[PDB]
């Protein structure tokens, strides 16, 4: 059956709880065991209150994203096709209660400082189901770090590590990512100057320049094992093909184009799309603490708007990786 929320946040770990993120989905919390950061994703389903203004998801609607969860957590542990650059999950629970004060307190003071578009969640009674998955922390998404990067050589090594990762999955789980916007990157420093994968068999590394690079959020992604499919069946859905004001709300519609609105295919075009979206990101709305002033960096520049301009006559992750002049 469901635990009470102490099962999952004992004492200790619930007063460490700090906020660092929330959507329409719920929030998610930093919080510390055993001297070892970690990240709260908490989700109300089953129940008739609005959050955030739509309905709850079901325990149904909510599987799809902790199968695909567990799926590209355990890549870091395969040997034919092998990654790290999903997020590690630590746990799954579902969870019965209402909100702890102690998270409506990390909650009020984020809303104080960064201020938040979701309803405090504080009217929840003690019958309220929720999943809570936990993840080992990632770090810092994409965006949040705009201006933070030191060159675009950083730029390199992030699109490197984002399609090996893609590939891998792939190859391995004929995946999608669906809605890879520069939220679902997180970046965290590594001491470790190579970082490994595989790939069909095949060892390669890519250089880090002291990142280690995370996929996140899995609500719209697809995959499938032994040709059944897990996916999220958007064909209905109005609200995320109308969006504009930037690049990210085409991708919805090009997905659509490619996918002629049957999201249960495997079209992995979409890793490519999302690539090139996060490619035009790097070029045009990240700014870099040393612009490319040497000339090894302007050749490094030279390539990744290369990059931009060619990558979208790729047909996967996969043909990017083994096929594309940015990765030889
Ligand atoms: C879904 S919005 C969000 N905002 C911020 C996050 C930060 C995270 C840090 N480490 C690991 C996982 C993290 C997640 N997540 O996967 O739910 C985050 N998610």
Redesign the pocket.
């Known amino acids: 059956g469901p635990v009470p929320f102490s099962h999952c946040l004992p004492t200790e770990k619930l007063q460490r709880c700090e906020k ?4 329409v ?1 719920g929030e ?1 919390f930093q919080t510390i065991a055993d001297h070892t950061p970690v ?1 709260i ?1 908490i989700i109300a389903i089953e129940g008739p209150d609005l959050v955030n203004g739509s309905h709850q998801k079901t325990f149904e609607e909510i599987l799809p994203e902790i199968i695909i969860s567990k799926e590209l957590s355990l890549l870091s542990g395969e040997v034919c096709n092998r990654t790290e650059g999903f ?1 590690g999950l630590n746990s799954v629970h579902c969870v019965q209660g209402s909100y702890p004060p102690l998270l409506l307190k990390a909650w009020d003071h984020y809303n104080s400082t960064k201020g938040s578009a979701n309803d405090r969640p504080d009217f929840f009674k003690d019958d309220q189901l929720f999943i809570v ?1 936990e ?5 810092i ?1 994409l965006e949040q770090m705009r201006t933070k990067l030191s060159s675009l050589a950083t730029a390199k090594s992030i699109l490197h590590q984002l399609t090996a990762s893609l590939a891998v999955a792939e190859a391995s789980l004929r995946f999608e990512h669906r809605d890879l916007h520069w ?1 679902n990157v ?1 970046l965290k420093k590594t001491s470790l100057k190579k970082l490994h994968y595989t790939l069909n068999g095949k060892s390669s590394t890519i250089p880090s320049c002291g990142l280690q690079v ?1 996929i ?2 899995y609500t719209l992604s697809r995959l499938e094992r032994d040709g059944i499919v897990v996916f999220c069946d958007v064909s209905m859905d109005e609200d995320l093909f109308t969006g504009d004001g930037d690049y990210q709300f085409d991708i919805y519609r090009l997905m659509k184009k490619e996918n002629n609105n049957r999201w249960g295919e495997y079209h992995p075009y979409s890793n490519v799309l999302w690539l090139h979206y996060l490619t035009d990101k790097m070029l045009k709305q990240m700014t870099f603490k040393t612009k490319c002033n040497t000339p090894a960096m302007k050749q490094i520049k030279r390539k990744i708007q290369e990059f931009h301009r060619t990558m979208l006559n790729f047909s996967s992750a996969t043909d990017l990786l083994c096929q594309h002049s940015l990765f030889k």
Request: aromatic share 14%.
């Open positions: 660092i993120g929330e959507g989905f998610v990240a994703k997020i998955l993840f080992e922390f990632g770090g998404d939220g997180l995370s996140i959020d």
